[PDB]
Amino acid sequence: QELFCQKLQQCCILFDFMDSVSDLKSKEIKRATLNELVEYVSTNRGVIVESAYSDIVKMISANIFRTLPPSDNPDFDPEEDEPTLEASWPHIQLVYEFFLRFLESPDFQPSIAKRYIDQKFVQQLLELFDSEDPRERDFLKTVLHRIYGKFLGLRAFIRKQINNIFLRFIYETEHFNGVAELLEILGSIINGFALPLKAEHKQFLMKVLIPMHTAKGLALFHAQLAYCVVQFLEKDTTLTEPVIRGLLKFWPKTCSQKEVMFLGEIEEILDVIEPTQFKKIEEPLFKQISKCVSSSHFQVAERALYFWNNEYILSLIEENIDKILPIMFASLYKISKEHWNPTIVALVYNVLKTLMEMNGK
Amino acid sequence: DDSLYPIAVLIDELRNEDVQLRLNSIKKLSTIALALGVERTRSELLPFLTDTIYDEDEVLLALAEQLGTFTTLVGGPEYVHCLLPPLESLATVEETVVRDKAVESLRAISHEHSPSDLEAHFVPLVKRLAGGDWFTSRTSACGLFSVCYPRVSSAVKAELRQYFRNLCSDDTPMVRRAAASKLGEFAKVLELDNVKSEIIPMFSNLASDEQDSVRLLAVEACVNIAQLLPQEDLEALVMPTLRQAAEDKSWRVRYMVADKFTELQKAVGPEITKTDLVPAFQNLMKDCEAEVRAAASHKVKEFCENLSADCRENVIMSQILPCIKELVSDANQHVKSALASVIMGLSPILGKDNTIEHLLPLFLAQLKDECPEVRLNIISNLDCVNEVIGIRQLSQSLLPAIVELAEDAKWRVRLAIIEYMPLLAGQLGVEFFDEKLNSLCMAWLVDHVYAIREAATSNLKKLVEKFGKEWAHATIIPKVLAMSGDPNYLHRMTTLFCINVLSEVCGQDITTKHMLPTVLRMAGDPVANVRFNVAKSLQKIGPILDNSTLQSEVKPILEKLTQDQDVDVKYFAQEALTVLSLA
Amino acid sequence: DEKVFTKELDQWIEQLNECKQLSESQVKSLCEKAKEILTKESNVQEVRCPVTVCGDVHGQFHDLMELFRIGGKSPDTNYLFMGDYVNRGYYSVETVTLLVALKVRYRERITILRGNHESRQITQVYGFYDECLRKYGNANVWKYFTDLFDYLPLTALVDGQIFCLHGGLSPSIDTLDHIRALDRLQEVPHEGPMCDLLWSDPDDRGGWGISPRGAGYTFGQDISETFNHANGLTLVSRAHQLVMEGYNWCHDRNVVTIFSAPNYCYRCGNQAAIMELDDTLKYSFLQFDPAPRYFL
Ligand SMILES: O=S(=O)(N[C@@H]1CCC[C@H](N2c3ccccc3Oc3ccccc32)[C@H]1O)c1ccc(OC(F)(F)F)cc1
Ligand SMILES: [Mn+2]
Ligand SMILES: [Mn+2]
16 A cells, blocks of 8 residues: 555656746755655665566656757866756756665665666666766766666676767767766776686777877876776786887877876886886887977976886886987987976986986996 | 889888878879889889888878879779779778778779779778778778769669668667768669668668767758659658657757758748748747757748748748747847848848838847847848838938947947948938938047048048039038047047048049148157158058149158158158159 | 068068968067067166057957957057967967067067066966967977067056056065166066066055965055155056956056956956057056867
């Protein structure tokens, strides 16, 4: 008898009051109903049955599934961070929390929910990742992590959708703003690799993650991408040379702001490579770093010179003396030019002294 | 070798470590290829260049465009097949620009391939590109079906159709988008029977795709299929597709349809138009989105202009005008800005008896809106009402509004009113504007901004020739000479410019009678600016004067100004003397 | 052989008015001649009464064209610009090129003063170096422009009554002679009288304060009054600081801030303004709105 009220009370919240249009006690009633239902389902376990799944999933679909209206983006810099298009956040927050708590229920039944959760549902849920505000993107990322941890049978479809989204974001257009919230969850879930590296798994890295370094807005998600990339090296050290070669051949020589980030990612990656595997890229990497340091730009030069502050980097450098040959000319030429910046001059002088500490020419 | 040696370009001059040198080499390789000989070239250079090139965008695009341009240096129309493996291997790259350029070069050289060579190499090439595992090859393969389908055997095209169908049914969105985009180019197959048999179901399934990009591309390419004019079948083949696409939720498709409404109506036909598009347009203009309504308001003029002349008045009065009230009164700014620059074009179609009663109030309401750009767009094309409504009837209503708004805060509105005045002033009469619109011209001439002063000078020089020299020597000469007694040099330069801008039209008489003394007196201004602007103007007024007054008075003044302490005025005086030929 | 070069500079100005950059060698020669011209100017460049004072531009070429439309073309009407033309602008290169070309052509007519943004470090960090690299592929043009900036005057004095400068007053500067004694031929330091002159801004508080920007000092009404009374000045004109109205009076009309970059970075939406000084130094303001319109 009480099981019918759980599905009869949903009819009231069946329709939407619309945040844009002025409302009355109706919106307050909807908010109160949701605020009560969240606590009810959080404190009362076991009331959900096979029939409630259909009603709740239908309500969630009718509530959240909707593409954003035409959004204005005059400036490309995200320093503004003004979610003007989103105004119903306090309302959708309740249904988001409801869905998150329902997924986090220990007695969840993925088999029963699979009757309604299908590829079209995953598509309608992923299209919302384009939300202008991050308050929605982070919650969508959390819901995606939860549904991936619960529904493991759809991992292939999720991976295919992510690959398609990344391919579209790379070539067609850079309008997708929820790329960071996907890259971070990807780098976090990749840590779960406990089996031998599959061919497709290792090919996706080189075919999707690497080519994504050429994006314009890389500064928005460079740390997450670098983390996801280095996560693959700690699992298999044999795939480091192709990754480093791809990063080298995709060097952004037209933007020093991206060059600094590339140098940072490189420094973060060399702490895993071994000397036997490092020798395969020693010569080209150092020949490129020579020109990078020769650049007449202060932050890139100081970031390339900081490499002499890591123990592992110092060890990999002192392993042989055949690597300072291309750097000696750059160090001797860097002191003559760029006199307006004595800091980089002193830095390169200290680096030359450190290189001279070891017997070399 | 008169040019770069062969072995050098082969191994020594292709050191792939330098990118710029190798790019220049691949760019200038034509000078060496034309000398190496077509035979040895097609024998050794193509496989060597295909095997040595690794993967760099610059040299890749260079080789692509070179092969595209080498269609003549190959030496034989039958040997062009040797240029197909390289372009095919280049099209399989992940980058989109280089593969697009390769597909372009391929479709360009396909017109030169012989029938035998074509059926022998181009068909297997596209079959291999469409069957590739990666999506880049599948996207690049759909670009060669439009050129290889018609000029091949009648038996192989039946298989090319199925190959294109399979390629369009890919499991990735990139291939589907490319197919939806290039179907408009591939839809030209002549065989209407096979079209109606096998293509229209594919088009219907494409218009119902889950992706919105595919839907908008399909409804865009729909024009290429509707251009066949199958009016006897559109009501059942394509009409339901356009109907179900009109009420679209992805909104992008609605905007795409709005941007293609005119091109669609151009081929849908008059009866189908009046039956379906007019309700569809009325429903689209009342949509909640802003872009669709803006496009509809911008294209309403072109839609009404291309409407059948049988009974346009009834339908437009019954459907459009009762609904445009909501758009003109809408709170959106871009919609009104786009509607203002097009609504005035409907004045002649509504007829003189109904236009001055229906569009006049809405026109006046839009002219007095708070949006400056709206008023600017309105006054920009205001020269379309005088040819439809009488001058007196137009002055009874709109002349007060325009002469009142002529002093708006935005200077661009004043400039538009100024540049539009000449026609209305000439159509009203010489006495009307001289007795009523004199204060407005005076306020224009005294503006602190230089653009409005130049516009007023141009209007004056245009009206003086439209009314003669009498009004010139009577009214404007003293009013312009009086402004020269102002303290601001920016106002003195105004008269200094207007003097010669009017002398270049009046002639020598009024010039040497009134303007010459003023310009030779202003030369004594203590401010350097005035006393070299005087030379700048003398450089232009010179030829107007005669040879007598020149040596009489203009020569000593210039010779004295040449000795001025400032170097700029000295150079200007020297240039004026040189142009004057006063040797 | 000066007439051919005058014609070349005239057609350079014409091309630059069309929003077209010059070549590397042309920019090098133009910067060399601009240095040769500016080396003769003092730290306190003397300007005469008829002139138009303008604020920051920041590479907004179309807004500079609108400014010229409002105030007039550079040849006839005189201009006194208070710096800032680099970074934070899509067309910074064309702006600086046109400005230096007008200066070389009409050194008497137009005047230019250095700004804090005209500094190697600031231009590199804020993206003018990036624009130069994109438009020329190397750093030669950037090097030439940064070397020329070292010769730009720091302050100007029109009619011996109105003191014009980019930043503001400095606690180590009491008289104009102290400014005339400074050595401008050097990169903008991180502190000192030059950095203060190029970074300082007015303040509602009393006395001297620390600039929130990390460089320069903040001064109140009393400081400006003392400086004006000790130097016999009538008004201190400055820019640097953004204002919603384009121009703003402060410190009992002892200091005026002018800003000529309307809709700064397409987000501020602030209006622009210019200050005209007629024959007898009487001032007037003119406000205007913005001009309407892979890795390799
Ligand atoms: O993402 S990319 O940076 N391409 C970029 C990404 C999209 C924009 C660029 N574009 C472009 C793409 C599509 C339409 C128009 C375009 O107007 C251009 C005009 C002038 C240069 C380039 C482009 C395109 O060129 C990349 C490069 C190489 C890769 O590896 C390789 F070589 F393919 F194997 C992977 C990715
Ligand atoms: Mn500043
Ligand atoms: Mn500034």
